Amino acid sequence: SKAVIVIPARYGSSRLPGKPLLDIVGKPMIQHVYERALQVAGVAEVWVATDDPRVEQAVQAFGGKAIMTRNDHESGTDRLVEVMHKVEADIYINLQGDEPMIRPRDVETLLQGMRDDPALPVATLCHAISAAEAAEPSTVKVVVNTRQDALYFSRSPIPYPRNAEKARYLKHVGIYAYRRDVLQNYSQLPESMPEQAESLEQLRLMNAGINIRTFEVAATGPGVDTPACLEKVRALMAQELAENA
Amino acid sequence: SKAVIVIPARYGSSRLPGKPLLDIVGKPMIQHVYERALQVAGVAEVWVATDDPRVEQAVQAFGGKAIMTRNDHESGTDRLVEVMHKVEADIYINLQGDEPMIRPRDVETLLQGMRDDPALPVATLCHAISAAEAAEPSTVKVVVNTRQDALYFSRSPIPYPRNAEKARYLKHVGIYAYRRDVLQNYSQLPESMPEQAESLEQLRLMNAGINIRTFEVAATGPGVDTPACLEKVRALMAQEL
Ligand SMILES: Nc1ccn([C@@H]2O[C@H](COP(=O)(O)O)[C@@H](O)[C@H]2O)c(=O)n1
């Protein structure tokens, strides 16, 4: 079973132009993600999928593998489908190019899950959050059954807190592992009403009856989207270097 | 493929004690439900499951069939499980004893669905509602996939209206059809965290991975929970004549 990690990294961003190129303790953000991806056991290759030459150059400059993709791509899953045709693997892992604090062990958990169950099409991550955090529409919640399969994903707080003290919330961590056949049949799936309403691409899979197992990990480090969280990551990353001396 | 309709009708109610015996244009509420149930094609028997001798006698008075069940059941579902042991069938339909405006056609849609797919364990109903109505925690919303299987049931407005004009909402109508094997295993299913938090018993099935197909019907009539709804139903069933 061959597994590869693909890191989508488009330059264009409204509140952070050239987001993957921002410096974090001396290296572009995209490099930190790539370096951590390389530490994931069981992965054959790591690639960066981009639609901008500057990103491709920055990646090659540190010796990373870059593959140009179409800029007309609406989603990071469509971009991964294009990569799938050129890069062969049985399992593709999609990592966010803007989460430099990703833990290699979490990707291994995800990979081990896919290998322990040959029938599993998609796998993703989640971690426990408080009810107060779950109230945010910018945070995606997920509810799972006993096998840890996702029942639904939503920006609405689910489960509804009728008996508030009994409610436990899970935040969805946007890292995915897809079997090859899922990506091959992907472009034929129609957009679902819940997907368009919620603006959550993963609901397109659920509409088609494709199971998504969700593994729970510890609270993940802060992503980068706000210049405030950027400074926190910078200090958190720097605090990490001195800790491992 | 033998199907039976079971109507849970406990005497008690915090807002309307003796609810099944309340008069609605000449007949107790339970009789209206029982008569409409008898109009459902494809069913072999209709039973009223109750805990009180007063309800049992009232049903026998109009010629219906009734079975005494334990008074310690927490829900009509548990009451149905007790009945399944006494009344043998392949498919059991659970009708609410407080919804006298039930349309026989809607129960036939549900039954047809179960017969069209022998692999389907549970089926239920739903109908379109507005965004305004979906915002209410007392209204249970359901989201389904292309095969109409339910993804989740919630009091929260699902789907979240990020793009409001794209959102379409469905209200769950508490009528169920269960295959016998689901009921034989029901007592072994543990309660789920989502069930306890939302206070929705059907989430106990989803937690165990049991599929629930949801068929869509037109807007249904109100049930009788409060004395206000009781007066509204009386008014509606009167003009319906
Ligand atoms: N313990 C319980 C609770 C409810 N039920 C039944 O469930 C249906 C709807 O519930 P409520 O009227 O209690 O709200 C009624 O037909 C009622 O008799 C039951 O049979 N046993």
Swiss-Prot record, chain A:
Q: Where in the cell is it found?
A: Cytoplasm
Question: Which keywords belong to this entry?
Answer: Cytoplasm, Lipopolysaccharide biosynthesis, Nucleotidyltransferase, Transferase
One of the GO biological process terms: CMP-keto-3-deoxy-D-manno-octulosonic acid biosynthetic process
**EC number in record:** 2.7.7.38
**Superkingdom of this protein's organism:** Bacteria
Classification via InterPro entries:
Cytidylyl_trans (IPR003329), KdsB (IPR004528), Nucleotide-diphossugar_trans (IPR029044)
Q: Name one GO cellular component term.
A: cytosol
| Pfam families reported in the protein's UniProt record | CTP_transf_3 (PF02348)
Provide the catalytic activity annotation.
Answer: 3-deoxy-alpha-D-manno-oct-2-ulosonate + CTP = CMP-3-deoxy-beta-D-manno-octulosonate + diphosphate
Purpose of the protein: Activates KDO (a required 8-carbon sugar) for incorporation into bacterial lipopolysaccharide in Gram-negative bacteria.
What family is reported? Belongs to the KdsB family.
Q: How does it assemble?
A: Homodimer.
Q: What is this protein called?
A: 3-deoxy-manno-octulosonate cytidylyltransferase
Q: Gene name?
A: kpsU
